[PDB]
Amino acid sequence: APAAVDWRARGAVTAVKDQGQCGSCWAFSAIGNVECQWFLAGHPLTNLSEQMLVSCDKTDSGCSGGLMNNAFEWIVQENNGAVYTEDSYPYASGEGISPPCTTSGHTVGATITGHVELPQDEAQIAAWLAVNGPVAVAVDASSWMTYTGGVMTSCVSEQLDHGVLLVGYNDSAAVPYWIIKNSWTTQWGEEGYIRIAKGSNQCLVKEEASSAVVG
Numbered sequence: 001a002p003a004a005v006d007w008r009a010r011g012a013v014t015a016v017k018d019q020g021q022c023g024s025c026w027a028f029s030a031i032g033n034v035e036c037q038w039f040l041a042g043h044p045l046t047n048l049s050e051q052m053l054v055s056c057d058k059t060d061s062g063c064s065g066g067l068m069n070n071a072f073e074w075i076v077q078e079n080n081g082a083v084y085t086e087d088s089y090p091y092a093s094g095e096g097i098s099p100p101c102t103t104s105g106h107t108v109g110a111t112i113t114g115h116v117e118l119p120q121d122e123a124q125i126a127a128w129l130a131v132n133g134p135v136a137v138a139v140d141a142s143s144w145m146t147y148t149g150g151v152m153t154s155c156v157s158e159q160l161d162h163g164v165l166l167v168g169y170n171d172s173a174a175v176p177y178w179i180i181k182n183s184w185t186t187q188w189g190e191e192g193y194i195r196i197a198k199g200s201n202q203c204l205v206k207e208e209a210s211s212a213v214v215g
């Protein structure tokens with residue numbers, strides 16, 4: 001695989017979003033992944049709807065949490081593969097109150113037919129990402145609440161608790177790293193991103209990696 005990849009440089013990643021006071025990171029992770037795959041599949045970069053999942057995916061638990069793998073199954077099995085646009089189904093859960101599901105009246109912004117779950121191995125995840133694009137991952141983010149920049153090398157790695165999006169890596173740096181999109185606005189971290197060291201399972205990053213299949 002190349003020494004370094006950054007899918008932001010490809011124009012494949014939407015702006016950093018704001019989950020607010022809601023445990024909906026699982027939805028931001030899954031939808032951010034779909035956004036990037038939809039662009040890479042030859043379409044304009046389009047903001048897609050986290051609220052669709054938060055309100056309508058009853059396998060997951062709204063502002064009380066969820067799993068990207070369950071979100072991807074819900075989209076395919078319960079929503080005909082459709083992911084609505086952000087503009088037609090905008091995010092409304094920032095104060096912790098998710099509106100009831102509405103089934104009518106939205107605009108389809110992307111279609112997926114499935115998803116992949118990747119091996120629990122940072123090298124294979126990086127090789128997949130280099131060719132195929134950003135990867136949704138679960139992490140332990142408990143120790144991310146003081147991060148202001150640099151490469152994190154001592155991530156507390158004990159319990160998965162947050163969904164995020166791998167968008168790149170750099171194996172040439174003095175400390176090789178992953179580049180991760182969060183959903184805590186651009187006012188946290190490095191314009192909304194964090195670099196964590198790569199190759200030591202920082203933050204349990206290898207454990208639950210996935211990506212949508214557009215089609």
Ligand SMILES: O=C(COc1ccccc1Br)NCCc1nc2ccccc2[nH]1
Nearest residue numbers: 023026064065066067138160161162163
């Ligand atoms: O909705 C998510 C998705 O993150 C994951 C969490 C666990 C596994 C995979 C993923 Br993705 N997190 C917010 C709600 C939450 N807070 C937790 C604190 C401690 C343990 C579990 C927790 N779940």
